[model samples]
Target: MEFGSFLVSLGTSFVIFVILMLLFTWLSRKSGNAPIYYPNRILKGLEPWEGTSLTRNPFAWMREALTSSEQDVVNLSGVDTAVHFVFLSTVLGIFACSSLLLLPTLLPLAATDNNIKNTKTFSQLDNLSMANITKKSSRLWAFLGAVYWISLVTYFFLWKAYKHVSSLRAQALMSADVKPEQFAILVRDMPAPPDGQTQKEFIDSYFREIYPETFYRSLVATENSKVNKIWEKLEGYKKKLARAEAILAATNNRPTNKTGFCGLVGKQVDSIEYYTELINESVAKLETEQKAVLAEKQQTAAVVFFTTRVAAASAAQSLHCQMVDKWTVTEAPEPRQLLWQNLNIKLFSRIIRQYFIYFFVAVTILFYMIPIAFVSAITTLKNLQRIIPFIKPVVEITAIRTVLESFLPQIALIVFLAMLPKLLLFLSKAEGIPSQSHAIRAASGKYFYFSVFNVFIGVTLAGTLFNTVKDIAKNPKLDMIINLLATSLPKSATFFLTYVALKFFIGYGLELSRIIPLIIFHLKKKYLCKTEAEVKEAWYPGDLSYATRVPGDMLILTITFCYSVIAPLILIFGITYFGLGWLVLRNQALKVYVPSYESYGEMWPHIHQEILAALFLFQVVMFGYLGAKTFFYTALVIPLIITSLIFGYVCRQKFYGGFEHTALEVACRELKQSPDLEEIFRAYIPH
Candidate 1:
């Protein structure tokens, strides 16, 4: 195909992608009105005691360490390592297969006679013989490229599957009703596979069973004692009445002397006699009834107002005993509950169907492409075994390998796509999310390391594949070993250029993502909103970086905006660019601020729009930053390294201080209050 045709096709493809993206954005906005998308109506409770992070994660760790669990720590770790390793292995296969297939194509144009010295320029190498070589190489390159790309795609699909399955398994610990083996079995059999649906069912099922209606029953039982306390107080009223009645009964019917001291005594006795005589019998009867009521209450209160502290004490003792005997642990049989059967079936069915898709996509590619790559590699290795091993020939052969491997760049594409989202998510969760500063800093540090590692992988893979090709090309005959100065210089120059470009894109993209909060803050102020975080739910910006706020709020906004747009484009130009969906979960642990006080009594929506916006902005910023930085730094920056001081400054900030108006002033002023309080107190106490 002509260069014009390639450009035309590429442009059309880009337009189509842009259209699709715009359509998705529009549709997402319209969908916001649906019942399923209601913002603030959702209610979330704390997960069951057993299912919480404090309980479940630790339990899982223990189970992994102590028992013969399939998802033990080692296996879990292996699964993680396998994702990238498989990615690398698949890319290697691509290079190997591509080089081997294209070897025959180049063979037809092998230099012969004095014409080899007749080549005036590199472009002159494209003669008729070279055309035939190009055509032959193109055919083989196309075939090998398809195989490598397909496998790369499958590896990505497998990576997603692994993530979904692992998430579901981790979520299961919260549900007393969720049985891992049974759930695993269901996952093995289900229809709709490891997508969002399966993940939700398992999580929901586990939460319900672990914290049931009966759990609230205990709380209500604890409240009944107040009523019994009131009844017991009524008994005191009866005792007072009985003592007054006894004093009246002793002077019952005495009357008489009406003068002076005798008159007063007679008046008092006469008044008592009149009251005793007038319904004195019923008064006694009232006293008797009060006694009966009090006696019955004593008995009934024992049942109603009473509770056994013994159970609490015994539970503590039991827990202590279990801790002591932790070494002798095993998987206890799951409790029988009505919800279990349906939940089991649902989880089983969902996981099976979802995992099946992952397996199918992954295995299909592996089956079709992996074997072919292996065949080519084995054939080439065999050929190399026959060739004379010398430096000049080795250099030429290595160059050939490098050129052929370039035919299939899809492995790079797949890797960039697969891992980028994970970093995006990490950023989304970290920014303004109320996590501890130290932990967030640690996580951020780890994330930076991970990005660096990934960048190294991409560059190394590209370089290695090229090196292998060049070695094969230079070692055509058993010529004397070429000097380091002669053989290494050209290839090393090429490697350096490629490596720099690749590193620049990766580093820029990642840092850009990290500073996304800054970008969104600026954009929000610049066009659609004041601050991205403060944007209305109905609106979304053209770019996601318009939602974050960190590093002096508005200050971050300006700096990040310039970084994101430039970095990504640079990377794309330099390399085909190395590229989540991060959303705020309005679940129990996270509480979004309702816009008004009246809304306080209302439960938060399952998804908080602000939080979602924040996360979305975070992802966009992070990935865009990474891609941009990697490309630019390689090409433009003569020297590149992250400043430790800036990193430290970012790490030192807190998530939130609650009151919006006076947060900074309060934080600053409160710093000296402790020492001030000590001085004031010591003055009075003479300490």
Candidate 2:
């Protein structure tokens, strides 16, 4: 095996991290650079002294993040981010505790064993893993002990984290002033009663009868036929024209534009005139469409605002009739988080859409295998020049070779592998997941499954460290995985090793520095931005990308926990990975990232469940590994599953209630006797 390339990758990845860190640090300090680095502070309207100021010296924020209290996190970001920090703390605490026992005991136990002495082939890798241990020995008990140790800490800390987060949730929810959705609930599937009843009359009459005086009003969906699409394209072209006009005004030149698909290339034209004509045409239809929209058929859904929060809560939770299919009520998302599409669709379509997305997800995962294996082949590098002698001259060079191996494969992985996040999240949106939080959570679960199924297990089978696990994928025998894992897992540590190294060193480097956005920001700042609002608009920070980020961290946890006993060498990297995450992400949460919408720490339960899934998978895999080791009492590991299951159950019971819905006691507590309920409810009405 060529450790040379891995050594090269480690060096280059560190170099990348170093360059990007200092680059961001230096670039972030200039007050003129506020638009790029301090977008969150600017958007949040926080004073620079709020600790979000980039005017501080380099590494000051890092120090602040490292030491920032729970209150600081809660104050700076929302409780959701505070809970995200709780995740990092949970993992750091779990492994930090497990490392004490496993690192000192297991490494020595594994390395010093007499298992591999008689083998013809051996290396330092074997010395650091279960590869060195004799099958069915007392030595296995040490690992089993370490296994139970992490699970023990795992449950304890998860419980503590859950307790802390749910407490945070209650305090935030209860202490907050009036919210837009407090007195509103969304009702769907209002079947038009009788043979010829008007939809609005049915809903308004129906709900008024149910609630009497508590019913404030209802806003039924308006179907504007096809004219809203004109608004969509008109808006699209208007924004594009503004950008074009911005460039023109800033440059003092009328730049010609191409009319083409996305304007990449086609017939050249005067951009302003073309876009102006398009805007005027769409604008011409607006007032006519307004009249049509007012007369439109109502959709299947409507929003009902009650006179009180408790009334809304009762309506949201209560069944309206014995014909449950006729009236469907759900707690309304905060107004901006609501999506208009798919609201008119009925129940059967949602279920059908689910399986339709599932099939595509299956296809996406399996087809991703093709490119991934090819990328692995490129990482192998031995096959490159051998297969294509024409490129042999280029392949032989060291400097280029290092990047090709160290950087390019990762680039390929990013390009080829990125379809999941967007695809999954877009599909989640299509399912009418009305809130950003729920859509992201749904997508996170989907991507996590894909990451584990394809990345971990696929890479384990691919064995990209020169030797290949040929035919395990093509072969139909599912039971063969036991033998495959037992034989390859110790050896396969290199794949996870290199991959995890690249993820932290380069992945986080790219995220923290925001090199791509930085480049675009420079272009916009210099040439395109003509006003402060447009400039600020160019670099508005988004909420944390939990769909991609949370699962990626959890995937690392899976790789870490799976190998902590079997390949003891990965433990330190595991600790560093999360430790670095704790430091870096906390800084982002407090300063760099901004919440699009705030909610209680509802994210914690999803996070809690994902970790439980990883923990369970760890137990099952370990059981399989030891069973193949001929350890007859692998049944002893069964208790770990029972332990995790019960712990998960207890957490679900104790804390999930707070996350599911605010308790009526807390929901009933009102901070305002006379708030602008009329304006608030009107603003919440869907346009």
Candidate 3:
């Protein structure tokens, strides 16, 4: 009876999702055709060849999305999109492959007909899960599947993924646009020069001495706080002048305003005359301040350009001085990506800030379970009624009770989890991350930890573990802990299955329809937009903030992998989740998103690391489950677990260097056709 209700809720939600997705597509097309038309709010800014014809036809778009090759994504969008696509492809491939092996061999062993312990209410899912493997001897097949079969599948898939990303990375490095950062090293923390020499002279002499032929030029960055103040005042005066001129044109009257503090507290003068004098004075002051900055206020940091990329790469990786910490050298970020305001932050200062934030993020991840605690308490109808006394009479009705029991908990979970990414983004920014990309990735990592604890651990194990801890504090029996987990863990399976189903149906449906983005776009366009710039700003479809998006996606994958072996039915749902997600994300990459910045697929390594973490987590959970099942020697798994750790470490060691630095051979080839160093030097200098 309980299983029948679960099926009903699952079916109902999926049907609603499909209908909403279709409705949203129709609405988007209708809006596209509106008079004094804006572009398709989702599909705006696409190249003509990218095509919006399919946007009107949902089936057409889905087919196009499903059929599109990785190369097509790379060519049209960027390698970042391709990398994400490959991740989905990898997940789908692994599960699809695992199903072929597991369903035939393991499914039969756990089938309901073969296992009399299966109750009448037991689902086909329950029949196929570890619940059917009641005997310790029966678990050997699962243990074998976990160690050998899953590992081999994961290894090959990861290898293929890594190979593909490396090729893409090489292609990007070879064909990338000529930029100064490619041929420059950003040097920081240089010792102050002797009394005879300026910082610029000191840097030039030192670099030239190190590599006479390769050193082309250097640009010392100015300490611009004073200059920025003057420049801001100049811009303010210019704005005042522009406004006065516009007023004269609009009203056909002489523009007159007081030359006073906010035009209220000082002597009055003609607005036009007052602004003109102010502008002249500001311009003169700005010029003097700018020159002074260039001459005397330059910071310890400088951009040292080489005649070739090879020289720059070499210097960036090499020890520049006897004291390693004295002269810090690293590959300069793309000039466009530089956070000029943060340029003065020394290496040590940045490192300290990063670690401090890491500690804070961990603490926050732990404490964030307070919301989960509240949501967990209200999951049952009686609990819900208890919390809100007015709901007692309402919940007494059988019809309302069914809906409340089935949907309320899921809705509460979704709403609470939705608030996390924004909070993470804010925290990441507070960490003083220099670029939007870095900030987003930092947030993604934080969100991943938060999801692992709150969504997975909190929902599934936290309450039971808390109870077990209290009992242990009093009784202190080891077997009590084992029995507690053995009972409570399996009971939580039905809840997690429900969680996964909800994530796929409601979560991916929201992703496909993009209802929130649509609403936001229309609201901003109607109420806020006035100028051309404002309209463009309103339409801006930002880069997929990997920080928010990646962790959630990775968390889903983690959940999928963790449950895939224990509850084999999760693989079927995992397949559906990722398959649907692939199509939706493909359409998004092609038509909706306008990439904000290119990291040249640096995020692939981060993705790889997270996937490895997922694998490790799967291994640990399996070991725990096996131990809870009262296995004689859980030690049999420790060696395999160590092997998994080693595999990840070896992968990081072998391949991560290429991600960090341009290969010397590749750099040398790039050096043969050098770009104009002077142009780049000027571009790299902070304006």
Candidate 4:
């Protein structure tokens, strides 16, 4: 009965792939859409067309994506995207191996069981699952064996990935060592001068007294903090002038505009002349304000640039004064990565928000459970067909059954998902984070944890609801989920099979084609985007959105772990999910997505640690499943849990340090007679 509907769902998934995949091939040939297709690739200095004709085969994008250079990806794409590939490659390998082992051994052994064969509705598919086996039978031993096999494979790949990430991370710091651009340290709560001494003079003399040989000029914060706003206004006026001129050139005439309130109701003036004069006026105003603001004693905060990386590292690591709060020092977050606006935030002011942020973030997770519970309680196990008894009678029609059963409930929570990931990203920024990359990890934590809890917690309860909702709430039992006369573990695994299937089929197809972004870009281009730079910003990229994407794949990874033993068939879907994701994600890394800030493989530590969480959960879930099976050697799984716990501890100790450790450990080597020191002094000086 369920078999035909599942076939219909698979047919639908394949059909989506056909259209979107071909839609992209045809659209990619339309050279006008190059910005929407390969913005980053073009920005990264790749020629858009490179002398090739627009007429090409359908597999052109596919072939190029598959054959893109790995070195190019590593070098151009940030460590974040590279580590994303590592997550993809790790899970992809694990499931590929699991499918190979489980399909031959576990799939056939469960297939031989008679429970589902005697079913009045369906036989072979349910027979090839945990629902078929006789309780307390010897068959659970092979499933148990495969569980341990997966555990071993997961631990081994995680260990390999951990070791590789640490080395690569340290290598990045090593490479940055002599770059000299990092010869600076951010200072906070800096003490005021003995009056009459300027903030710069106060900072300059204090550090110069200690290490005058490498001392360079320091610019107190708050000057650029305010001036940058005016500077931005200047940029807007300049761009507006350029766009106005572009319109003038196209129309070959002077464009006039009302000079009245909000440009709506006065005498017509040349728009180009108005903007050009505004640019001229703002330039002179900004020049005077820049100097005026520098003299104003603001927050007593500054970043002191040093002539040498070694001296700056030492200074950043050293406390500047006897009173601890007078002069606080920390490693610089680099110019672009620094949170400039919030630079002068006083202590106790923002620390309170951390508590507030955590409280609010905690509420997000707890509140997230409500929607899932209500949704799953109804649709998790046939809320429609069971409650609406009249509808169940008509559900015997194949088309209605598949549309109702296979399609609707499987994608039931995507609406919740779409809204939640964006909310979580916004919440991560309000936590008083001082750097761009710091918020990235927090968002990752928020999203991955949110996904796992939402997908699994109520999901386990949903099946038990088919029998009695109060029974599940009262017992809260993990192993005793099923009331087998009604629903079984295969019924639960069946939902996840469709979950991952839709994720791979429609989700990746949608990701690759980027139809939403394409339409959005065209809309922006048509109505608002005027200048070349604004046009680039219109469709170029966001931060590659690793926060949601990492967990998106990790969701499949977690599902594969939870269901790998209960129903081995989902393992096949698991392989294709990560396998296709590897190609899809990597190609996007190659052709799109620029970094906001580099995490320098810092995410890799948290990533595989979360992988350990999945492994740990897998062992616990399989342990529970075994106990429910009444398998005699159920105690064997307890050690696998402890082994994974130790594995987590060992990897944390072994690898996490390399990310936290700085280039300070790698040799304080100066550049070999570098010619760039003059340029560094010029840029690092106070304007």
Winning candidate number (lDDT):
2
| Preferred candidate (lDDT higher): 1 or 3 | 3
lDDT of 4 by residue, 552-597 (tens): 7777888888778887888888888888888877767777778866
Q: Which clashing pairs does model 3 show?
A: none
> What TM-score does candidate 4 get on C-alpha atoms?
0.86
Model 1's alpha-carbon lDDT is 0.27
Q: 1-687 in candidate 1: lDDT tens per residue?
A: 112322333454355444544433333233322211222222222221223233343233233223433233213222222222222233233334333443343333332212223211111221212211211123323323332332333334333433443343333222212121111111111122255443334333432353343111110001223334443444444433343454446446333324357334433433334444444555565556545543322210000000111221122212212232221111111122111112222333444644554444345333334333332232223223443465235436543444333322323433443443444334433332211222222233333333322332223333334324445555533221222111222222222223233333333333322223334434555773332232343222111121121111111111121111211111122222211011111110111112211111001110111112222333343333332222222321111112222322332232111111112222232223122222222121100
Of 2 and 4, the candidate ahead on lDDT is 2
Instruction: For model 3, give the 10-residue run with minimal summed lDDT.
Output: 33-42
TM-score, cand. 2 vs. native: 0.89
> What residue runs in model 3 are displaced by over 4 Å at the alpha carbon?
1-12, 28-56, 107-128, 135-140, 194-198, 225-295, 380-395, 398-419, 422-439, 463-483, 531-534, 671-674
Shift of residue 8 alpha carbon in model 2, Å: 1.4
Model 3: per-residue Cα lDDT over 381-452, one tens digit each: 342353458876666766666675568677777776677788877767766455566767778777777777
Clashes of each: 60, 0, 0, 0
RMSD of candidates 1 onward, in order: 29.5, 4.2, 5.1, 4.1
Which candidate ranks first by TM-score, i.e. highest?
2
